[PDB]
Amino acid sequence: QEQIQTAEREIVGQDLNCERAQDLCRRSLLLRAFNKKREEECEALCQSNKK
Amino acid sequence: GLQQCMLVSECSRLLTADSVPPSDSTSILGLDKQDLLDLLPPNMLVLWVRD
Amino acid sequence: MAQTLQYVSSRLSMLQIDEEDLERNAQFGKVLIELCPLLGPNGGSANLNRE
Amino acid sequence: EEEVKALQKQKNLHIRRRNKLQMVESGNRQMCLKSKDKEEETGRAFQEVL
Amino acid sequence: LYQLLDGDNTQKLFRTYDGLESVAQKLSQDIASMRDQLEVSEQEHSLLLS
Amino acid sequence: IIQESQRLQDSIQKEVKHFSAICLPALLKVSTDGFNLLPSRELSINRMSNTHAPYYGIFKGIYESVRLPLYKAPESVLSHVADMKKQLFFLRSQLSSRSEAI
Amino acid sequence: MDEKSTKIIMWLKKMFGDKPLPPYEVNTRTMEILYQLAEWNEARDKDLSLVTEDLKLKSAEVKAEAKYLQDLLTEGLGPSYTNLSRMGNNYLNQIVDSCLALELKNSSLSSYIPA
Secondary structure (H helix, E strand, C coil): CHHHHHHHHHHHHHHHHHHHHHHHHHHHHHHHHHHHHHHHHHHHHHHHHHC | CHHHHHHHHHHHHHHCCCCCCCCCCCCHHHCCHHHHHCCCCCHHHHHHHHC | CHHHHHHHHHHCCCCCCCHHHHHHCHHHHHHHHHHCCCECCCCCEHHHHHC | CHHHHHHHHHHHHHHHHHHHHHHHHHHHHHHHHHHHHHHHHHHHHHHHHC | CHHHHHCCCCCCCCCCHHHHHHHHHHHHHHHHHHHHHHHHHHHHHHHHHC | CHHHHHHHCCHHHHHHHHHHCCCHHHHCEEECCCCCEEEHHHCHHHHHHCCCCCCHHHHHHHHHHCCCCCCECHHHHHHHHHHHHHHHHHHHHHHHHHHHHC | CHHHHHHHHHHHHHHHCCCCCCCCCCCHHHHHHHHHHHHHHHHHHHHHHHHHHHHHHHHHHHHHHHHHHHHHHHHHHHHHHHCCCHHHHHHHHHHHHHHHHCCECCCCHHHHCCC
16 A cells, blocks of 8 residues: 555656647747737838838 | 547647637746647648548 | 434444433433434534535 | 455555556656657747748 | 535634645644554553453 | 836746746636635635645645545545544543453 | 622523523523533624634635636636536536535545545
C-alpha cells in the first residue's frame, strides 16, 4: 500500500508538467497573432514613409 | 490540425469578453477573435479533422 | 419497553438512554418516539435533511 | 482461514494493481521525458517567436 | 468552512487562511485525542475487569 | 511627429514584457447568473482544486489536515467536515458514558 | 436550571410547531437528556444549513463551468462531439457514472486510481 501511494504521487506530479507545456503553446500562438498584426502596422508606416 | 483547432478555440476564449460591447473593451495584445481565426487550418482540413 | 429503547437508540444513537429511564418516565418515552420522525437519523431536523 | 483467504485475495489484487500502476507510471514517465523534450521544443518555438 | 470549524464563537474581525488551517488541524487533533482517551478508558476498564 | 514616435519606441518589446508576467487562466471569464462575468480562478471549485491557483498550497494543507483525499470533489469538503464534527460529538458522548460506567 | 428549561421549551415548540406538546414527566434526568438533544440538534442544524448553502453555490459554479466546456468543445470540435454512436454514448455514460459514484474531481486516471 505504501508502494501504491508512492506511485500515485508520481502520477499526480506528471499532470502538472503537461499544463506548463500547454501554457507555452497558448502564449506562442497569441504572440504569433501579435507578430502578424504588428507586421501589418509596420507595412502601413512603410507606405506613409514612401509618400 | 486538431492541436491547432483546440489552441485557436482556447485562445479565442481568452480574448472574448463576449458580453462587453466592442467599443470599450481593450483586448490583450490588441488581438480580436478574427486575428486568431486566420491561424486556423484551411477549412477543408478543419472539416476533415472533425469527421 | 425494550422495543421502544431499541427504536430510540437506533435513530438517536448519541442519546444515552437506560431501560430504567423509560420505565420511570413512560410519557417521556412517547415524546422521544414523536421526536424521532422530526429528527433525521443524523440528529438534524427532518426539513433541513430534505432540503 | 476465510480471513487468510480474503487477505491472500487482497494481496493478489494489490500485486496486480501495483504492476498496473508501475506500467502506467513507466509509460507516463516515458511520456513525461518526451513531454520535457516537447517543453524544450515548444520553449525553442517560443524563443523563435520572441 | 471557518464557521463550520470554529463556530460563531470567535468574533475575529479578520479570518486568515493560516487561521483556517489551524482550526482544521485542531478538529483533527480533537478527534485523535478523543480516540486516545477512549482507548485509555478501554484499558482501565479491561484492568478493572481482569 | 518626434513626440508621438518616441511614445511608440520599443512598443512591441514593452507589451511582450508585460504579457510575459500575466496568468492566462485569470483572463478566462465565466457567468454564473447570466450577468456577472467572474474570472474562472475566483470560482470556489477552482480556488480549491486548480494546481495553478495561488491558493492551491493553502487548500492542500487544509485537505491534509482534514484527511480529505486530493482526488475528491471540492464540493465534498464542507460535508466531510460536518461529518467529522458529528464523529467528534459521538466520541464525546461515548467517553462520557464509559467514564460514568467505570 | 431555569435557563436550560426555557431553552428546551423553546426548542420543543420549534420542533413540534402547531402540534400540542405531549405531556411528559419533568424531572432532572429527562431535562438533561432533552437538553443534550436540543444542543446537539441546534449544532447539527447550523452545520447542515452551512453545507446546504455551499451546495447551492457549487451547483451554480459547476453549471457555469459546464457551459464554458460545452461551448469550447463546440467551437473547437464542432457539433461532432455530441453525435457519438449508441456504444460511444454508453461508454461515455459509464465513465461519467463511475466518476460520480467515486465523487471524483475529474475523469483522469490520477483521480480514479486512488479512489
